[PDB]
Symmetry: none
Subunit: 104 residues, 6 copies
């Protein structure tokens, strides 16, 4: 699949690692590509590769670090946001940042 890149900053990425899934309603739409520490904030910055076919995702969308069952692997849940039609189509594209994150 061709993919596009999104960025997100979390206070804490817990057990999230590269190759961790990104899901929408529990369906895999992408992967964590990289995690590094922002030199300016010392907050972790995550790089996501989302599949190009999932490409009308509003900017108001949020990312949560979740675990699959009690003893499972960590993953990112993309919660697809409400978009006020009176404020256009603000859509996530290659290079954009998801502003709304939930850590730990």
């Amino acid at each position: 699949e061709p993919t596009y890149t999104l960025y997100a900053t979390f206070d804490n990425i817990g057990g999230l690692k590269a190759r961790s899934p990104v899901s929408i309603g529990g369906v895999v739409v992408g992967r964590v590509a990289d995690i590094t520490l922002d030199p300016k904030t010392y907050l972790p910055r995550v790089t996501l590769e989302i599949e190009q076919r999932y490409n009308h995702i509003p900017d108001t969308s949020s990312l949560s670090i979740r675990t699959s069952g009690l003893l499972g692997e960590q993953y990112l849940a993309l919660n697809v946001g409400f978009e006020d039609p009176e404020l256009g189509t603000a859509i996530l594209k290659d290079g954009d940042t998801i502003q709304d994150t939930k850590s730990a």
Copy 2:
């Protein structure tokens, strides 16, 4: 066994995958045949193959994503509904949608 098809849309299908069981009172009556995420609604849509012998299931019946014990596999629980026969008899048939769905519950 001959089967019939039902559809269901969830907000979140959690760890449900194709070939996941569909059960009534813990007895397997079907299989998840397909899961796709709708590119237009970003809601997951599940296709079920239910065995033809389980055939008088009211429309008011619900589907829940449950887990078998704490550390187990995810499955679909069909909770068989009520329709007052005196007020007309609405039954799930090949191609119908189950409207009442309960999504995977998370941490909290």
Copy 3:
């Protein structure tokens, strides 16, 4: 061991499967032989094989689906009922149904 057959209907048999134990105070007295869902009631019906040596079980006896510890297998707990001496001996025999069941 020779066995006899008992039947029981539950709202929900959870993780119960064929070959699941039937126990009295945690001692194994039988096995689940079959589970079928009645198409007419949509209630699961369990067939049990109880060991012939445990053959003075009152009719008023009850079955519970329990789990063995936190992480364990599901089993059936036979709770041995009250036998009114003033009303004689009503005893479970090959083909009888245990009426009093507790699910999930």
Copy 4:
């Protein structure tokens, strides 16, 4: 080691099985030898083999079914009883029954 045999009835023996340890303050002093269901009471009946060197155990002593940690094996804890000296020395010997049990 030579052993002596004690008997005990529980309402429920949970996960207890033959070869399960019997301990005093967490030290192994014997083994569960046998578990059966009493034909007369339908209560589980446990046979213990205590090492002969642990042989002045008062009859007021109790048995508890415990688990070793959350996810561990079930074992029997012998709690060594108070015996009023003014009412004699009543000691457990080969063949005796421990009357005070705690199940489940």
Copy 5:
């Protein structure tokens, strides 16, 4: 390493076995050398070998049976006591008994 011997009696040693660690603030300072059940008191008696370098531990120090995480091995935690020096300076030495013990949960 040279070691010295301490004794301790518990009501219940739970899952403690010979070779079980003895730790101070989570650092291993010794080993359980022996466990016997006293046939006379039916109390378990634990023999410890503490490393000689850990050496001016007050008598008022306590031993606890703890578990390392939920699913872990049992160990002995030596909690180093206060002693007011003005009221005597009593130290655990080869052969001494730790009087203050806390038994398995």
Copy 6:
């Protein structure tokens, strides 16, 4: 990677061992190199190797012993402190001590 050394004293290091990670928001920035118990204070002293690229960590930063999930290994969490600009900028360098520590949390 080149690393620099930091020291820290805890009341209790719990399950911390050599090669245990040091992390900042769950990203690994170093390793526990050594643990010794001071015979004089009976307080454990930890030696850390932090990667040289993480080198503007304020002195006011703190270390916590945490566990990764319910059943996981112990690690050190470096919580990056506040750096007052107005009175000048004190940074951890090879050989410095982290003063602010939080020990392994015990039975309830």
